[PDB]
Amino acid sequence: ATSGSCKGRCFELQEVGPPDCRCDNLCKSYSSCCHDFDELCLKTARGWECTKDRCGEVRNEENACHCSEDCLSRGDCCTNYQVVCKGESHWVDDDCEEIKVPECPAGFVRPPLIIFSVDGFRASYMKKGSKVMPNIEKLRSCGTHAPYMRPVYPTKTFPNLYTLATGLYPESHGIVGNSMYDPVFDASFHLRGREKFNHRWWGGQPLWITATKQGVRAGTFFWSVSIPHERRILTILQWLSLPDNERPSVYAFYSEQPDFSGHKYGPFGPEMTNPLREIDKTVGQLMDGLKQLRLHRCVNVIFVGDHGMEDVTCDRTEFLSNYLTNVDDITLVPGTLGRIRAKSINNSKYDPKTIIAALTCKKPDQHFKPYMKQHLPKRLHYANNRRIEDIHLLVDRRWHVARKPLDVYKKCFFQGDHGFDNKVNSMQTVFVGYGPTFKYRTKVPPFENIELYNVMCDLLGLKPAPNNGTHGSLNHLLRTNTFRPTMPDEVSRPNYPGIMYLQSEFDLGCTCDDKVENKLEELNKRLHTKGSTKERHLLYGRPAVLYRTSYDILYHTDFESGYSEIFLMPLWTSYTISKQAEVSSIPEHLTNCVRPDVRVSPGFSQNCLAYKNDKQMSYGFLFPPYLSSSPEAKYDAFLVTNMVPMYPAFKRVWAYFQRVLVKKYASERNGVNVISGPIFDYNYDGLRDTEDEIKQYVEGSSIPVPTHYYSIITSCLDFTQPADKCDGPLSVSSFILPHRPDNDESCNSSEDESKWVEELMKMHTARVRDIEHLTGLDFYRKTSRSYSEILTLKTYLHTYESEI
């Protein structure tokens, strides 16, 4: 029962043992507050602002906040008190002055952190709404800011806030949507309802728990809906005046705006100016309140959004009923994404394959694309959770998907929505960091919100729980408190084999027209096989292998590789193509040439016979024959140790990349270095498969079939310098292409490769870091750049969007 009292307990920080009634922030959410909660803890009398007449008033405990002489000591002045009653200036009116050191009251052990979060705050509001947000604009221009921050997918509220709290992808923390079904719980999670409150949904370790476990106290992060914003601000300010042994060090504020209005009015509806005004005034209240408590040059403030907002209306809805016949046999999680599962598990007459086929390229202008979850772009990291349905629909920006038209009129309401692919410009959101530990007047490049958890932990002197950020990749945001990152140690050292086998030892079923045999160039041919050109084709040192395996370094005139004796193919193949380089064809007589490698045993080689016998699987080459430096060097490209298994449908993509695109990138970027290789992720967890996890081999062999192929393409950021002679910062783009036996993903694939290939590759853009997880390799080990800068480079994603 709720029979006790909140007198002296308002917004208490510890949760009281039930059923003793509660006075903490969550009580309202559980219907468990004491009977006098509203009266005592949610006072509203006289508003939130001191006025001239209230100054020096006789304290009255009924007031929402206070203008009496004792209010600073009691910690409960209205935020504008010192301005009205003491002739002080608003914080926004003060010039900004660099904060070189924390300027905190006696008893403060560390600068507090306040996370000020705003729902639906699209990145471009910073520029487009600048005239109406003077407090936010001062934070932004005086502190450290990014032009935008990339959310996680789906670009919904709980998945993104819980990613901020934990540093984890939604697939790992478990909050994979604003709505979800868990098939093991046989339970559904919604925005409505009490289900979302069960701790069984929320995995990982959020910042507040990380803090508590290491002796740093945390304010509440979840604010009950009914508590107004002025009262949240005042609660944080009151907690900040607690005695040293009770005062938290980490605080959060949350606003439902501008998202709430953005849904109704669209992202730039005229109605949107006022919510931006109101958020700014709330920021003003906090800064004035901090400055009153002499904390405005002590506290680190993060102003951060969860996602942006796109124009979306009822009439831009695709209906599954217009594609399927058995539309009543499915359940759809609708909207700016789609997730489909059977309406009943006691129905084995349910075929995902027929459903996908019925949804693929059916209408010329189709505004979604179906995927099995394991085939989604690896950059989304959206598969490894039982709450993610096998069938996913990626919806075009500005559109919705729904099951049947009745779901739209029997559920126009709205003009804005969010949830799309996280590379979409309209879904980008904001980051500003302001305070003694952040830099002064500094712009940093856009980065992903998965990285912030490590930085908040550094800000608080905490050791972060295991997470998906790359610790040190955001060191450049901070004045001090930088983590000191170090390269992981190489686990496996390579072998450097010489010529050990005679041709006749091999029985691989391979042939080649190669017997058309001079000490000027015979000394040189041995030179190249020993590593003379290795400084040209391996520019950043050899990748380190971070797991236990057996592998060989193989040198060639045009390329170097790391050849795995366990997977029977290279883990990486590295080569440099200069701006000047020539493309040539595979000579007629060498169309089907494959040559045994005299450095590598028959027993650790692939064989041509398995490919002949496997009617589905063909093969390609990692270093492409088309880019050989001479007719003589081209023979190296046909070594058995350069070959990888490729479906004919995939060879269309691969050959166009190698024959056309590598050269175009070299021309555009003043040379490129390329590192290519296979990826095996049969259990779709984003991590390198062990040999015993492989589910497909080339028929009747031990040759494993990659699920994906990658390339990392590096050049000089200053493109006046050639890739191979670059003195400064690097520039990288990468991809992870799915290795698929059809091109059903590309609706225009029946046309020439020049109309569809590059579009596919763009969709499958990747971070170097994503490739490192998938390979157990560590790249860029020998450069002249600092390790923190290299970590930033490894987290870079080339998105192919236009400028914000």
Ligand X SMILES: *[C@@H]1O[C@H](CO)[C@@H](O[C@@H]2O[C@H](CO)[C@@H](O[C@@H]3O[C@H](CO[C@H]4O[C@H](CO)[C@@H](O)[C@H](O[C@H]5O[C@H](CO)[C@@H](O)[C@H](O)[C@@H]5O[C@H]5O[C@H](CO)[C@@H](O)[C@H](O)[C@@H]5O)[C@@H]4O)[C@@H](O)[C@H](O[C@H]4O[C@H](CO)[C@@H](O)[C@H](O)[C@@H]4O[C@H]4O[C@H](CO)[C@@H](O)[C@H](O)[C@@H]4O)[C@@H]3O)[C@H](O)[C@H]2NC(C)=O)[C@H](O)[C@H]1NC(C)=O
Ligand Y SMILES: Cc1cc(OCc2n[nH]c3ccccc23)c(C(C)C)cc1Cl
Nearest Cα residue to 414 out of 260, 565, 220, 525: 260
Question: Contact between 380 and ligand Y (CB under 6 A)?
Answer: no
Place of tokens 């694309």: 369
**358 interacts with, out of ligand X, Cl ion, ligand Y, none, CB within 5 to 8 A per kind:** none
User: In the complex, what is the shortest distance from the CB of residue 592 to K ion, in angstroms, rounded to a whole number?
Assistant: 12
Angle between helices 787-795 and 768-775 (to 10 degrees): 90
Contact flags string 320-359 toward K ion, x per CB under 5 A: ----------------------------------------
Q: Which of 147, 203, 461, 485 binds ligand X (CB under 6 A)?
A: 203
- Binders of K ion among 605-644, rule CB under 5 A? 611, 614
Q: With contact defined as beta carbons under 8 Å apart, do 500 and 490 qualify?
A: no
Cα–Cα distance measured from residue 291 to residue 312, given in angstroms and rounded to the nearest whole number: 41
* 157 has catalytic annotation: yes
**787 interacts with, out of ligand X, K ion, ligand Y, none, CB within 5 to 8 A per kind:** none
What DSSP element (H or E) covers 793?
A: helix 787-795
- Binders of ligand X among 3-32, rule CB under 6 A? none
Dihedral sign for Cα atoms in the order 219, 224, 230, 235: negative
Whether 670 has a binding-site annotation, put simply, is no
Q: Which of 82, 117, 155, 715 binds ligand Y (CB under 6 A)?
A: 117
Q: With contact defined as beta carbons under 8 Å apart, do 173 and 453 qualify?
A: no
Contacts 24+ apart (CB under 8 A), 67-72: 72/292, 72/293
- Binders of Ca ion among 689-718, rule CB under 5 A? 689
Q: How many residues bind K ion (CB under 5 A)?
A: 2
Q: Which of 111, 120, 174, 305 binds ligand X (CB under 6 A)?
A: 174
Q: Which of 80, 157, 449, 711 binds ligand Y (CB under 6 A)?
A: 157
Tell me if residue 147 falls in helix, strand or coil.
coil
Q: Are strands 765-766 and 730-738 parallel, antiparallel or unpaired?
A: antiparallel
Whether 360 has a binding-site annotation, put simply, is no
**259 interacts with, out of Ca ion, Zn ion, ligand Y, none, CB within 5 to 8 A per kind:** Zn ion
Rounded to 10 degrees, what is the CA torsion of 254, 260, 263, 269?
A: -100
CA 211 to chain centre: 24
CA 170 to chain centre: 10
User: In the complex, what is the shortest distance from the CB of residue 176 to Cl ion, in angstroms, rounded to a whole number?
Assistant: 8
Beta-bridge mates of residue 713: 674, 733
Cα–Cα distance measured from residue 362 to residue 351, given in angstroms and rounded to the nearest whole number: 18
Question: Contact between 153 and ligand Y (CB under 6 A)?
Answer: no
Whether 513 has a binding-site annotation, put simply, is no
Nearest Cα residue to 645 out of 546, 765, 757, 741: 741
- Cβ–Cβ contacts within 10 Å for residue 597, how many? 23
- Cβ–Cβ contacts within 10 Å for residue 461, how many? 14
User: In the complex, what is the shortest distance from the CB of residue 262 to K ion, in angstroms, rounded to a whole number?
Assistant: 53
Cα–Cα distance measured from residue 749 to residue 742, given in angstroms and rounded to the nearest whole number: 10
- Of 40-48, 65-73, 76-84, 466-474, the window that binds ligand X (rule: CB under 6 A) is 466-474
User: In the complex, what is the shortest distance from the CB of residue 381 to Ca ion, in angstroms, rounded to a whole number?
Assistant: 12
Angle between helices 134-142 and 273-292 (to 10 degrees): 60
Q: Which of 148, 153, 189, 221 binds ligand Y (CB under 6 A)?
A: 221
Whether 119 has a binding-site annotation, put simply, is yes
- Binders of ligand X among 468-527, rule CB under 6 A? 468
User: In the complex, what is the shortest distance from the CB of residue 243 to Cl ion, in angstroms, rounded to a whole number?
Assistant: 43
Q: With contact defined as beta carbons under 8 Å apart, do 177 and 152 qualify?
A: no
Nearest Cα residue to 723 out of 665, 784, 672: 672
Q: Which of 144, 157, 235, 707 is catalytic?
A: 157
In terms of CB distance, is 2 or 179 closer to Cl ion? 179
* Breaks in the chain listed by the residue before each, with C–N > 2.5 Å: 411, 517
- Hey, what are 146's tokens? 């990014």
Give the binding site for Cl ion (CB under 5 A).
177-179
Cα–Cα distance measured from residue 149 to residue 125, given in angstroms and rounded to the nearest whole number: 13
Question: Contact between 743 and Na ion (CB under 5 A)?
Answer: yes
**574 interacts with, out of Na ion, Zn ion, Ca ion, none, CB within 5 to 8 A per kind:** none
Helix/strand/coil percentages in the chain, nearest 5: 30, 20, 50
Q: Which of 581, 687, 717, 747 binds ligand X (CB under 6 A)?
A: 687
**685 interacts with, out of Zn ion, Ca ion, Na ion, none, CB within 5 to 8 A per kind:** Ca ion
What DSSP string describes 436-480? Answer: TTBPSSEE---EEGGGHHHHHHHHTTPPPPS-SS-TTTTGGGBSS
Quote the DSSP letter at residue 745.
T
Whether 470 has a binding-site annotation, put simply, is no
- Of 59-67, 160-168, 565-573, 650-658, the window that binds ligand Y (rule: CB under 6 A) is 160-168
Cα–Cα distance measured from residue 577 to residue 626, given in angstroms and rounded to the nearest whole number: 11
User: In the complex, what is the shortest distance from the CB of residue 749 to Na ion, in angstroms, rounded to a whole number?
Assistant: 3
Whether 683 has a binding-site annotation, put simply, is yes
Whether 685 has a binding-site annotation, put simply, is yes
- Of 255-263, 404-412, 419-427, 453-461, the window that binds Zn ion (rule: CB under 5 A) is 255-263
Question: Contact between 800 and ligand Y (CB under 6 A)?
Answer: no
Question: Contact between 204 and ligand X (CB under 6 A)?
Answer: yes
Instruction: Reply yes or no: is the peptide bond before residue 134 cis, omega within 30 of 0.
Output: no
Q: Which of 259, 306, 421, 681 binds Zn ion (CB under 5 A)?
A: 259
- Kindly list the catalytic residues: 157
Residues near Na ion (CB under 5 A): 743, 746, 749
Positions touching K ion (CB under 5 A) are 611, 614
Residues that bind Ca ion (CB under 5 A): 681, 683, 685, 687, 689
Q: Which residues are annotated as a binding site for 1-hexadecanoyl-sn-glycero-3-phosphate?
A: 157, 178, 259, 418
Which positions make up the binding site for Zn(2+)? Answer: 119, 157, 259, 263, 306-307, 418
Q: Which residues bind ligand X (CB under 6 A)?
A: 168-169, 171-174, 203-204, 381, 384-386, 466-468, 686-687, 773
